[PDB]
């Protein structure tokens, strides 16, 4: 950063790493017929077949117009019943499907009812202070008002993510690390920012320029990507 550029010298980035979102997979499936009897109460689940038996019992009792009007009234109100519950079941499914997918980070700044918070004292909080996007400076105003979701540690945000609806907000490299090592926690969305990380040298280091040339050779030859595999995928 330019304050760190003025402070100390900097070679070309050894990695350009952003910040990204982390939340756990909720991991839901849909269980059988038990999830298929859902709009109606078990009383009516008895009442349906206890009404359905009666038509057959009076048709067998007749063996001892008639059937015309009877059968017309039965079909006539069977249609009413199935129209009511196909309306209720289709509108049940459609009010189900309209909720998803409102998980936006633009949707975070408006309200307090989702947790989403930085690793406090990281560069994440620095970036939220430095944020000039209205949504993320409103999230910054959210975090300033009351912390609500602010964690300080990596494991603290992991445990807040496992114990709440907590978007853990931290650097993308530690999220890659953890999601290689923990499949429940996953990176939600993509990067929040793209910013470069450099090697600190004294102010007035020609060592830094050698280090710059060596970084050019290294990332030309991808020797660091071996190190990327061995430290991020383990």
């Amino acid at each position: 950063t330019h304050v760190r550029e003025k402070a100390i010298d900097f070679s070309k980035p050894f990695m350009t790493l952003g910040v990204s979102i982390l939340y756990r997979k909720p991991n839901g499936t849909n269980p059988s017929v038990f999830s298929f009897l859902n709009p109606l109460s078990p009383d009516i689940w008895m009442y349906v077949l206890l009404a359905y038996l009666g038509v057959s019992v009076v048709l067998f009792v007749i063996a001892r117009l008639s059937t015309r009007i009877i059968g017309g009234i039965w079909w006539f109100f069977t249609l009413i019943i199935i129209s009511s519950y196909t309306a209720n079941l289709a509108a049940f499914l459609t009010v189900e499907r309209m909720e998803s997918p409102i998980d936006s980070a633009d949707d975070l700044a408006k309200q307090t009812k989702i947790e989403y918070g930085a690793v406090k004292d990281g560069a994440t909080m620095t970036f939220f202070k430095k944020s000039k996007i209205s949504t993320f400076e409103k999230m910054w105003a959210f975090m300033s008002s009351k912390p609500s979701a602010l964690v300080k540690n990596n494991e603290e945000g992991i445990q807040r993510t496992l114990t709440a609806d907590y978007a853990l907000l931290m650097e993308s490299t530690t999220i890659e690390y953890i999601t290689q090592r923990n499949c429940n926690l996953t990176q939600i969305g993509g990067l929040i920012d793209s910013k470069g990380y450099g090697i600190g040298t004294p102010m007035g280091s020609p060592y830094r320029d050698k280090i710059t040339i060596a970084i050019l050779q290294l990332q030309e030859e991808d020797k660091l990507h071996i190190m990327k595999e061995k430290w991020w995928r383990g």
Partner: peptide, 22 residues
Amino acid sequence: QKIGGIFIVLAAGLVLSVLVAV
């Protein structure tokens, strides 16, 4: 229920009896 009068209507329809003996 909401549909409760309709559930009464469904089973009301069975005792509707017309001539058969003659």
